[PDB]
Amino acid sequence: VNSFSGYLKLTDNVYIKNADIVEEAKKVKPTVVVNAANVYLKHGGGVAGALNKATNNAMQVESDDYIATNGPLKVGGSCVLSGHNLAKHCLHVVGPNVNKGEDIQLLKSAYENFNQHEVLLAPLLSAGIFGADPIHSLRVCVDTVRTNVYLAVFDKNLYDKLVSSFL
Numbered sequence: 636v637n638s639f640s641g642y643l644k645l646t647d648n649v650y651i652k653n654a655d656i657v658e659e660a661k662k663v664k665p666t667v668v669v670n671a672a673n674v675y676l677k678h679g680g681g682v683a684g685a686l687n688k689a690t691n692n693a694m695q696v697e698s699d700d701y702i703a704t705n706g707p708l709k710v711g712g713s714c715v716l717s718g719h720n721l722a723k724h725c726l727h728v729v730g731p732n733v734n735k736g737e738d739i740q741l742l743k744s745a746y747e748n749f750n751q752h753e754v755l756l757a758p759l760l761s762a763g764i765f766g767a768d769p770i771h772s773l774r775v776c777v778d779t780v781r782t783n784v785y786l787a788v789f790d791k792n793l794y795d796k797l798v799s800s801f802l
């Protein structure tokens with residue numbers, strides 16, 4: 636039993652809910668919240684800027700120190716950093732930004748990072764500014780992640796479309 640409430644069960648391991656991932660993290664304080672990161676961990680907008688804003692910029696301060704030591708992530712890669720006031724840990728995962736020419740095949744590699752964590756609260760990857768179509772992202776998620784993932788999807792029109800179109 637875990638603390639996640641109001642989710643629709645899609646599969647044995649994948650759950651979905653119309654809720655801001657920021658709002659949800661504050662309420663649940665999960666072990667792991669996933670950030671929709673870029674390779675520079677520059678949290679300017681969307682999931683990352685909203686998560687970072689909710690940490691009063693402490694996520695960005697920690698992230699800048701990480702990059703100064705380690706250099707950029709890979710597209711499809713991840714790192715584990717603090718969850719600050721939102722979660723124990725934040726798994727920063729870089730999905731394929733299609734508007735920068737980043738191979739559509741890399742979304743599966745991105746979701747494979749989730750398998751290193753038994754339970755996660757997560758954004759659909761490569762939605763919004765990444766230039767990808769969310770129905771595809773949910774399919775790859777379901778076909779790739781084997782651990783227990785709670786997808787906070789903050790677009791009802793999109794939530795309802797994802798549910799209604801789910802095979």
Ligand SMILES: c1nc(N2CCCCCOCC2)c2cc[nH]c2n1
Pocket residue numbers: 654655656657681682685758759762763764787788789790
């Ligand atoms: C969950 N998913 C989020 N997505 C879903 C909406 C599609 C993306 C639009 O760019 C944010 C993307 C957000 C954003 C702020 N909070 C969130 N929580």
